[PDB]
Amino acid sequence: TNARSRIKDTDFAAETAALSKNQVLQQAGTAILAQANQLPQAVLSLLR
Amino acid sequence: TNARSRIKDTDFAAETAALSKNQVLQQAGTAILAQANQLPQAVLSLLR
Questions:
Q1: Is residue A12 within 8 angstroms of chain B, CB to CB?
Q2: What would the 3-class secondary structure string for chain A be?
Q3: CA-to-CA distance for A9 and A26, rounded, in angstroms?
Q4: Cβ(B42)–Cβ(A10) under 8 Å?
Q5: Angle between helices A12-36 and B39-47 (to 10 degrees)
Q6: Which of B46, B38, B5, B15 is nearest to A13 (CA)?
Q7: PTM comment for this protein (chains A, B)?
Q8: Is the CB of residue B14 less than 8 Å away from at least one CB of chain A?
Q9: Alpha carbons A45 and A40: distance in angstroms, whole number
Q10: Burial B5-39 (b: 16+ CB within 10 A, else e)
Q11: How many CB pairs under 8 A join A and B?
């Protein structure tokens, strides 16, 4: 059972940090997407 | 009869101390389980 824990039981002490990192990169990516999806309409309204 | 005593009669001057010691180990084990079963609760409730 101890070997099964070391091979299976997750050491979530770092996996919680990893998943929080993943979700903050998610929010960052969505933020950059939202701010980038405003560039073309702006430059077209500027050149027109 | 004295031979039967020396071979069968418990010299409970030692078995009484053994009973006391075993009761000590039983209570200690109960307390150790009560203390250790709270480790996952604490670590998960505090880390999440």
A1: yes
A2: CHHHHHHHCCCHHHHHHHHHHHHHHHHHHHHHHHHHCCHHHHHHHHHC
A3: 26
A4: no
A5: 20
A6: B46
A7: Phosphorylated on tyrosine residue(s).
A8: no
A9: 8
A10: eeeeeeeeeeeeeeeeeeeeeeeeeeeeeeeeeee
A11: 4
Choose, out of A12, A19, A20, A23, the residue to mutate when testing the contact with B (most B CBs < 10 Å): A12
Angstrom distance (rounded) from CA B43 to CA B2: 62
Q: Resolution to 1 decimal, in Å?
A: 4.2
In angstroms, what separates the C-alpha of B48 from chain A's closest C-alpha?
Answer: 7
Q: How many CA atoms lie within 13 A of B43 on its CB side?
A: 10
How many angstroms separate the CA atoms of A40 and A34, rounded? 12
Please name the helix (run of DSSP H) or strand (run of DSSP E) that holds residue B41, with its range, or none: helix B39-47
In chain B, residues with a C-beta closer than 8 Å to the C-beta of A12 are: 47
Instruction: Please enumerate in sequence order all residues whose Cβ is within 8 A of that of B48, keeping only pairs 6 or more positions apart, or say none.
Output: A16
